Amino acid sequence: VDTAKGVIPFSTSGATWAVPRLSEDGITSHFLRRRGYVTMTQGGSRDQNAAVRKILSLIIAYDIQTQACFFISNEESMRITMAETMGVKDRPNARTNSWAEVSDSDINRGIAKALKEGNLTLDENQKDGFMKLVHAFVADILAQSGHYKPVTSVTYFSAPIDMESDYLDPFSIAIIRDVLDDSPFSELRYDARAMSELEDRDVPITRFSRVMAQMGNAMVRNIMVLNEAAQRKLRGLAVVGEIVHGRVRAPVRYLNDSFIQTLRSNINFHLLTRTTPERWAQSWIQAFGSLKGWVDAINGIADLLSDLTPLIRDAATSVEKFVTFAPLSFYQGLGSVTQIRALDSSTNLAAVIVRYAAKEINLIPAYQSFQVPTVDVAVKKTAIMDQRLSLQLPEFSEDQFFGMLEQRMQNMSDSEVAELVDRIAKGETPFGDVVKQLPGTSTLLVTNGYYMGGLLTNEDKIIPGDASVPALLYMQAASFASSVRFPPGEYPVFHHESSNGDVRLTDQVSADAQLSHSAVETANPLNFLVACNVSVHTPSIAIDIIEPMPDLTRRGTTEYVHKGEIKVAAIPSLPPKSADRKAQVSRETAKFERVLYKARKGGAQVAAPIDLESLFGIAVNLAVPTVKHVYSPDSKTKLALDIIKGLESDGDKAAATRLLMTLARAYTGTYSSLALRRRDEITGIAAQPSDVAMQEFALQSGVQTLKAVAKHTGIMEVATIEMVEEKVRSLDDNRFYEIAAEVVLRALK
């Protein structure tokens, strides 16, 4: 390192992971801390709209933001939004008064009409972002005017910035997010004279468009400048990447620079830049295109400089602002690592369990709403009175499922394992994505997090060779490394050294690995789980969601505007008759939700009406918030079923049939009250008073009502309930009746 000629490699004891600098800003969600929603507002006052316009400034991405600026810059488009806001024609000789008062609604239906006639093609998400910005701009212009006189405040919920997706690349996200701080939508700069002329006189609508156009036209240039600043920052990062791996070096000194030094021992950067990134090369094409041409020019020189020291400094400011560099030590979770050896005892391990944990939401509050009309169908205004009920999830513990799976992997012999691995490596997925071969090694692993939050998803670049690898495993594994080599232009090589005997000499490690007692040296960190004695009883950090459900807590005061973040219940009402219900229930073409099973004994087809109205409230339209989960009931139940299915194939009825029972109990039990009271009496057809046929109903209605509720309120997919119901029909006859008896006993109390 710091060699008389160029760059030679060092192995620092502490190499830094790069993570997003943790903020309390309430505008973003990271991979460790998730945000369901950002609360927002339309109207109220000019200042309220300006607070939001700033938050919108940061939330909405360039494409949408820049597109909006270009729309604003266009005279003819803005003429229409204004002309229609006022209700005069969009024509040269068209006049608006000074006493005209513009509500929020007036603006939006104006903007809408100029989108429609505007004749530009926008995605549903882009159109929504466009409406939020162009409104906030037009309402500020008109307040300054000022014709803006808002009838009320309305609160919507937009989604926070997404940094769940990109762990292991903090940098590119940081540069963009700094440059957004100085967005054209943050603070609007006015031309006082023009404005004065629009005020307090009869003015042609033409005057309004022209001045808004020029303001837009300035926002467009404002952006052109921001893009050039972002490219400079990226340009600089590419250069640093070229220095680190020494594709080109004229600097001699720069190795000293405190930023550059920090990056050299940042495994994130090192990997990202190993082969030059395209994004960072793009920025260079303007100044010298391709990048390689600039790279050749410096190698001609080494055989200007004052501009190369700023580029690096420019980049760095942002990075430091948004990226903290971390001790390699964490993250040693947030996953429970428990290793398991083959039943045949040797210095060899069958499987490596890694259980990531996070907070789920066990129940969801539901509120009576009434709907307030608006011009547009796509968006709906609702007002929420009171919490009538809380809707209940399944609530089944994930502990037991990996418990039966532990035992299974313990009783796997040495050869049995390597068979299942080969079996799996050929494409077979007996356990689904619970059990996969530990990438690059000849053991298998049993993770949670392929199924939750999309924690584990495989990207190619990190390990050498052919095995793609999920980031948070490489990250959790490499965090068990004592020091790290850093060759220019090559993968990082890791070293673990822990004394003494508690290290195994095994067949399962990747080919590039050296092995000794109390040591390992490989480019694939996952090898430190084969077979170094590393385990963690419980996970270091739980994954959290803030404001997972849109907080409608101030609702007595405000109305809400939503597009699926809240769902209002469309419940079919039963016909109100003793016997006219029964006339339709049997037909099995009836419209209202019902229990439909075939008796386990015998048996005749059962059909019984589910009366959601009596559950939900008599005259009530349950408004129910859509929960942005980390671990969604659907992808959890889908875990359990894939574990059950995988145990079923390996010859473990005792386990698989026990787990399915656990799972069943949870689905049936929650709503297993009316149920037995709904079954009562003559409504449920056809049965005769029995110990068993009746307690069967108790199960079947308990799931089928949960199903019917999950249908009419967006709690969970109906599909995953039927997935279970099917697996429960294939449950053993004696077990199913044992569970049913268990449900009736709970119900009586």
Residues between 181 and 210 with contacts to its own copies, criterion CB under 8 A: 181, 183-187, 199-206, 208-210
Asked if 238 touches its own copies (CB under 8 A), the answer is: no
Q: Supply 692's token pair.
A: 């068993």
What span, in angstroms and rounded, lies between the C-alpha atoms of 659 and 638? 13
Asked if 619 touches its own copies (CB under 8 A), the answer is: yes
Q: Supply 717's token pair.
A: 């997919």
Q: Report the C-alpha dihedral over residues 633, 638, 640, 642, rounded to 10 degrees.
A: -170
Site for its own copies in 673-692 (CB under 8 A): 677, 680-682, 689
| CB of 566 or CB of 703, closer to its own copies | 566
Tell me the window of 222-230, 243-251, 604-612, 722-730 that interacts with its own copies (CB under 8 A): 222-230
Of 195, 204, 198, nearest to 88 by C-alpha is 204
Specify whether the CB–CB gap between 630 and 453 falls below 8 A: yes
Site for its own copies in 319-358 (CB under 8 A): 358
Terminal C-alpha separation, the chain: 75
Site for its own copies in 546-575 (CB under 8 A): 556
Q: Supply 647's token pair.
A: 């145990």
Site for its own copies in 650-669 (CB under 8 A): 652, 655-656, 658-659, 662-663, 665-667
For helices 733-748 and 692-712, the axis angle rounded to 10 degrees is 80
Tell me the window of 259-267, 381-389, 582-590, 715-723 that interacts with its own copies (CB under 8 A): 381-389
For residue 264, list its beta bridge partners: none
Least Cβ distance, residue 544 to its own copies (angstroms): 28
Asked if 611 touches its own copies (CB under 8 A), the answer is: no
The residue from 386, 580, 588, 732 that contacts its own copies (CB under 8 A) is: 386
Is the peptide bond between 84 and the residue preceding it cis, with omega within 30 degrees of 0? no
Tell me the window of 81-89, 242-250, 299-307, 598-606 that interacts with its own copies (CB under 8 A): 81-89
What span, in angstroms and rounded, lies between the C-alpha atoms of 65 and 505? 57
DSSP string, 488-527: TTS--EEEE---SSS----S-S-TT-EEETTEEEES-GGG
What span, in angstroms and rounded, lies between the C-alpha atoms of 693 and 608? 13
| CB of 73 or CB of 705, closer to its own copies | 73
For residue 701, list its beta bridge partners: none
- CA distances, 431 to each of 354, 405, 409, 446 (Å): 15, 10, 12, 9
| CB of 373 or CB of 501, closer to its own copies | 373
Asked if 643 touches its own copies (CB under 8 A), the answer is: yes
| β pairing state of 363-372 and 621-625 | antiparallel
Site for its own copies in 122-181 (CB under 8 A): 147, 149, 151-152, 177, 180-181
The residue from 160, 216, 492, 539 that contacts its own copies (CB under 8 A) is: 216
| CB of 100 or CB of 250, closer to its own copies | 100
What span, in angstroms and rounded, lies between the C-alpha atoms of 497 and 87? 77
Specify whether the CB–CB gap between 90 and 80 falls below 8 A: yes
The residue from 8, 26, 51, 95 that contacts its own copies (CB under 8 A) is: 95
# residues contacting its own copies (CB under 8 A): 181
What span, in angstroms and rounded, lies between the C-alpha atoms of 730 and 664? 12
Least Cβ distance, residue 358 to its own copies (angstroms): 4
Place of tokens 């488009």: 77
Binding mask 422-461 for its own copies (x = CB under 8 A): ------------------------------------x-x-
Binding mask 40-79 for its own copies (x = CB under 8 A): -------------xx-xxx-xxxx-xxxxxxxxxxxxxxx
Kindly give the residue spans of alpha helices, DSSP state H, lying in 670-691.
676-679
Asked if 369 touches its own copies (CB under 8 A), the answer is: yes
Asked if 371 touches its own copies (CB under 8 A), the answer is: yes
Site for its own copies in 494-533 (CB under 8 A): none
Site for its own copies in 275-294 (CB under 8 A): 278-279, 282, 285-286, 289-290
Tell me the window of 315-323, 373-381, 430-438, 710-718 that interacts with its own copies (CB under 8 A): 373-381
Least Cβ distance, residue 195 to its own copies (angstroms): 13
| CB of 99 or CB of 501, closer to its own copies | 99
Classify 681 as helix, strand or coil.
coil
Least Cβ distance, residue 542 to its own copies (angstroms): 31
Please return the burial class of 202, using the count of CB atoms within 10 Å of its CB with bins 0-12, 13-18 and 19+.
exposed
Asked if 649 touches its own copies (CB under 8 A), the answer is: no
Tell me the window of 255-263, 328-336, 537-545, 639-647 that interacts with its own copies (CB under 8 A): 639-647
| CB of 94 or CB of 747, closer to its own copies | 94
Q: What does the angle CA 642 – CA 647 – CA 649 come to, to the nearest 5 degrees?
A: 100
Asked if 700 touches its own copies (CB under 8 A), the answer is: no
Of 171, 243, 143, nearest to 19 by C-alpha is 171
Please return the burial class of 696, using the count of CB atoms within 10 Å of its CB with bins 0-12, 13-18 and 19+.
buried
Enumerate residues 6+ apart whose C-beta is below 8 A from 726: none
The residue from 86, 139, 477, 698 that contacts its own copies (CB under 8 A) is: 86
The residue from 636, 638, 711, 712 that contacts its own copies (CB under 8 A) is: 636
DSSP string, 601-648: SS-PBPBEE--HHHHH-TT-EEEEEPP--SS-HHHHHHHHHHHHHHHH
Asked if 377 touches its own copies (CB under 8 A), the answer is: yes
The residue from 376, 419, 588, 691 that contacts its own copies (CB under 8 A) is: 376
Tell me the window of 263-271, 359-367, 503-511, 726-734 that interacts with its own copies (CB under 8 A): 359-367
